[PDB]
């Protein structure tokens, strides 16, 4: 089976990944330019982290040198149009104007885990695989790239997570073909979550899933619809529910 994780996360003005010219990385989608965070940054951000340090694990999930890793991380994409900005700075002497680039955007992240590959890499152990899945979920929920963080303390937390158990891999990037336009009676994160909701309201009409928002701040579906099997307001409870569905293990 395959476990798919979708995350929606808003970040404060920062520069978490830049190119050789110092500008934030970008991509092209929906006929517009969007902000991008590289996959090999989110990986090595989740990896090599102190929090994640909780049959050798950390290699079965992410391989090294025919290990056949069981974790797949995609490229983070923005739900709106990119808005790069330039900051003009000078250096004092206490005894020449330079420019830097920064941006702020809301990102959609996609992760996939193959359960059978994880079990086979662990040589039949099944409790260790569940512990690794829980640890990876906790680490991915509470980790950010260590870019220009000393000048841009961007330590925001995700505002919505969806865990799915589909038969085939598929990403919901097509829910963001039209860039999000902010209206007075809503905000950016709410509109992004509504756009996501109006992509699983379809498809089924024309599997199960667990939805998590902090203290039920943003509920999936702008109605009393059953598009989500369970709505959970705690991260540990979400981990426990996923652990139970994996085959009934205790966190």
């Amino acid at each position: 089976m395959l476990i798919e994780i979708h995350m929606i996360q808003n970040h404060s003005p920062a520069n978490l990944n830049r190119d050789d010219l110092g500008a934030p990385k970008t991509c092209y989608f929906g006929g517009v330019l969007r902000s991008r965070i590289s996959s090999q940054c989110i990986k090595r951000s989740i990896r090599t982290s102190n929090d994640f340090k909780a049959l050798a694990p950390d290699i079965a999930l992410c391989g090294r040198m025919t290990v056949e890793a069981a974790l797949q991380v995609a490229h983070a994409i923005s739900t709106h149009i990119a808005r790069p900005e330039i900051d003009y700075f000078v250096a004092a002497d206490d005894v020449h104007i330079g420019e830097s680039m920064f941006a702020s955007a809301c990102f959609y992240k996609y992760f996939s885990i193959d359960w059978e590959q994880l079990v086979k890499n662990l040589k039949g152990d099944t409790n260790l695989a569940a512990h690794t899945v829980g640890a990876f979920l906790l680490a991915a929920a509470k980790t950010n790239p260590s870019g220009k963080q000393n000048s841009f303390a961007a330590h925001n937390y995700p505002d919505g997570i969806l865990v799915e158990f589909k038969n085939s891999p598929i990403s919901y990037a097509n829910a963001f073909v039209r860039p999000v336009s902010v209206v007075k009676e809503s905000d950016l994160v709410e509109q992004s979550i509504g756009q996501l909701s109006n992509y699983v309201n379809d498809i089924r009409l024309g599997v199960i899933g667990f939805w998590f928002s902090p203290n039920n701040r943003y509920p999936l579906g702008y109605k009393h619809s059953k598009l989500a099997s369970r709505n959970i307001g705690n991260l540990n409870e979400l981990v426990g529910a996923v652990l139970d569905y994996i085959g009934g293990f205790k966190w």
């Binding site: 517009v32 104007i97 420019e99």
Partner: protein
């Protein structure tokens, strides 16, 4: 133990009927018109053709029969190569092909191939280890043919080849081997002695064709193959015993040695004109695409001129002892005159793209990178423009202003991101931003 280039199969070809095959030199000359040379790397596709051209020159010199167009290759060429069967041998105690006497400088056989890491090179994109994986006989032959054309400096105490830094290589293309041989047949009055003959001598000044085309800057031995059941690390063919180690010594190039390559492109000062591609965008460079416009002013004014056909360009970027990239291209040329100013402007376009990139969004600042978003859209526009390369070179229906249109949509898309406001000032700024285009600079 015993291996001959005339009998054993080492030449990878594809027949015009659609069947890939690996045949020998004798059969390659026999058919020569129902097949094309098939190689993934342009380097081998170039050196094998150069070797075939040199062999044809030798056969014509010693037989006095030229290859007629739209016909099989001359028959009398085949017996002559049969007589000189002792000069094409890869092993044994005697005369060796493109080799010399043994030495004590032992090196694994991986420095003959540029793309496979060796010694201090980092093995990330190709997992290899010295004296563990080797090459087959065909790959050894294909790597011995790269010495005269694609040899770079070795750092301290080791020089380059006869052509110094490997420059661009421009020739003519055809749909069959005989056609390609017949479109680049121009011989000289002085031929010299080829390297595959008896011991080559620098002797006096002047070089000729056969000696220059087969210059050997290094001495190599190719010890022996060791039994095993591994696979070649260059082609991947599941095979038998391979070679693992050899001996390499450096041959300096004497001063003087007046030589002009039939295919190389030179600058105004006589230096080699090489590709200018890099993996990064520094203060004096902007990464766009293959630089197909560089060896055009020199070629269409010094050697080759205007001629209807297909121009094949091979470019190999390098920096000291480090390899960067290789690419190739084919341009359809009709041969309709030339304009000096326009060709010179076309030959200098990287500077124009850099100048376009370096312009800041507003103001003038020293040491400013300048609008990095334009560099993200430049490669796509360059790729779109490169389709009409033949018409842009000769100015038939394509012009600089015609190619300037491809940037409009991308700049319009970028302007929305750069000025995300719904005011009059933002719209005026977007209108000003849309009208950016490179400017031709001739010097």
């Amino acid at each position: 133990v015993m291996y001959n280039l005339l009998c054993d199969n080492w030449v990878n070809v594809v027949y015009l009927s659609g069947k890939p095959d690996r045949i020998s030199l004798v059969q390659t000359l026999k058919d020569a018109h129902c097949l094309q040379l098939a190689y993934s790397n342009p380097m081998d596709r170039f050196t094998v053709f150069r070797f075939l051209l040199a062999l044809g020159y030798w056969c014509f010199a010693n037989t006095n029969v030229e290859p007629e167009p739209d016909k099989p290759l001359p028959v009398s060429w085949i017996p002559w190569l049969e007589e000189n069967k002792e000069y094409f041998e890869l092993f044994g105690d005697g005369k060796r092909f493109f080799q010399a006497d043994p030495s004590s400088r032992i090196r694994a056989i991986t420095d003959l191939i540029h793309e496979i890491p060796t010694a201090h090179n980092l093995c990330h994109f190709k997992h290899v280890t010295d004296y563990i994986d080797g090459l087959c006989e065909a790959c050894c032959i294909k790597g011995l043919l790269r010495l005269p054309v694609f040899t770079t400096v070795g750092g301290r105490g080791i020089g380059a080849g006869i052509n110094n830094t490997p420059p661009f290589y421009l020739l003519w293309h055809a749909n069959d081997l005989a056609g390609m041989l017949a479109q680049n047949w121009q011989p000289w009055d002085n031929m010299g002695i080829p390297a595959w003959l008896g011991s080559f001598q620098k002797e006096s000044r002047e070089v000729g064709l056969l000696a220059g085309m087969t210059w050997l800057p290094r001495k190599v031995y190719l010890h022996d193959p060791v039994p095993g059941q591994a696979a070649c690390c260059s082609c991947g063919l599941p095979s038998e015993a391979l070679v693992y180690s050899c001996s390499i010594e450096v041959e300096p190039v004497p001063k003087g040695l007046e030589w002009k390559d039939p295919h190389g492109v030179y600058t105004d000062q006589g230096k080699s004109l090489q590709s200018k591609i890099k993996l990064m965008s520094n203060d004096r460079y902007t990464f766009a695409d293959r630089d197909w416009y560089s060896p055009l002013f020199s070629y269409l004014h010094a050697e080759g001129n205007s001629r209807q056909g297909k121009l094949w360009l091979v470019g190999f970027a390098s920096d000291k002892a480090k390899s960067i990239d290789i690419w190739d291209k084919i341009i359809e040329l009709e041969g309709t005159d030339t304009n000096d100013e326009l060709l010179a402007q076309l030959a200098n376009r990287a500077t124009a793209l850099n100048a376009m990139r370096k312009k800041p969004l507003r103001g003038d600042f020293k040491k400013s990178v300048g609008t990095p978003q334009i560099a993200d859209i430049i490669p796509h526009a360059e790729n779109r423009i490169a389709i009409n390369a033949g018409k842009m070179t000769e100015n038939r229906g394509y012009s600089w202003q015609d190619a300037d249109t491809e940037y409009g949509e991308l700049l319009t898309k970028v302007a929305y991101s750069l000025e995300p406001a719904q005011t009059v000032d933002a719209r005026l700024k977007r209108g000003n931003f849309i009208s950016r285009k490179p400017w031709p600079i001739i010097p």
